[PDB]
Every structure is written in structure tokens, then in C-alpha cells.
Amino acid sequence: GIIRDLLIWLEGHLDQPLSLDNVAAKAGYSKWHLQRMFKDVTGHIGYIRARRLSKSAVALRLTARPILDIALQYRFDSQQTFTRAFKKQFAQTPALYRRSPEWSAFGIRPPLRL
DNA sequence: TGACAGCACTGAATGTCAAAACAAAACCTTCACTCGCAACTATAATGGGAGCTGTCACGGATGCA
């Protein structure tokens, strides 16, 4: 029942509030108990990383800002830490992703509309 | 049985050298067209002015005289 409210706030707050699990522990419950409370609902929450990589991927293709704002806008640690997450997930360079004139759904994790 | 607390373990990823790479093209040679300096030519013709001035005028100065 209760932690429905985490789902689309996370659609809205992968932004300027740097939310970690202890910042996600501000949703009422503990660090370890929110995990399995999210697990049997969804199957897959720390999804957040995907939204961070999905949520950064609105900035590559659909806004004209270059790459250095992107690795620090949507709450990743660094430009290699971004591309470490990028290459584990999308298996590309984002300089080889946005510059390419074609773009399809290989690595971009969907948001949970459960 | 009830909901919910916070530890246990697992794996993925984060931080690690590395050369694989592509482009800032800036740093070098090219090859040249052109822009640049240097030399000659052999009826024969032999003193500059040069368009300007426009009359200030004393006390002073020296130079001669």
C-alpha cells in the first residue's frame, strides 16, 4: 500500500535533490526494509540508477547542452562514473550515441508505470 | 497474526593501470606563383632661377668705418 508515493516523485526527483537510499529512507521506513517492500511489488529500487541514466538521456538527444553538464545534472558522480554506468548499460560511448543519427531502445531502462 | 526494524550476504559497480582509438588541427615540411630586386639600352641634343615677397618696427647689437 504505502510506498506508491516513491514511484513518480522519483520521476520528478532524480534532479537537484541528491537522493541516496538514506535520503530514500526519508520515505518513512528504514534502509533495509524499503528494499523488499519495493521488491515484491516490482521485481526489480536503487531502477533509480536507470532513471538517472534514462533521465540523463533526455539531455543528450533532446537538449543542445554538451556532455559535461549531463554527468553532474542528474546526480551521477563524475564523467567517467557516468560513462562507467553508460558502457555497462548501453555499451556505447555517449559521444558515439548522440552523434549517431539513429537511436533505438537497446539499453534505456523504462520507467516503472507498474 | 500482525507490521515493520535493521543486521546478514551477494553481486554489481565503483575506482584502477593500460593501449585501443579521433580530432584541436597547431607545428612542420613541401611545391610553386608571384611579388621584388638588379642590370641594360649606343642620330644626338652641354650654366637654376620662378613666382613666391610686399616695404611692421623699436630697442638693441654688433660690425665697421
The residue extents of the domains of chain A are 1-52, 53-114
Q: Is A46 helix (H, G, I), strand (E, B) or coil?
A: coil
d(CA A9, CA A87): 27
CA of A104 to C1' of B15 (A): 31
Resolution of the structure, angstroms = 4.0
Using C1' positions and the CA of A86, the closest nucleotide is B13
Strand B: list positions under 7 Å from protein Cβ: 4-8, 12-16
What is each CA distance from A90 to A28, A54, A78, A103, A107, in whole angstroms?
A: 34, 10, 17, 11, 4
From A44, A108, A94, select the one nearest A66 (Cα to Cα).
Answer: A94
3-state helix, strand and coil shares in percent for chain A, rounded to the nearest 5: 50, 0, 50
Judged by C1' against the alpha carbon of A46, the nearest nucleotide is B12
C-alpha span between A9 and A11 (Å, rounded)? 5
Residues 4-43 of A with CB under 7 A from strand B: 29-33, 36
Structure solved via: cryo-EM
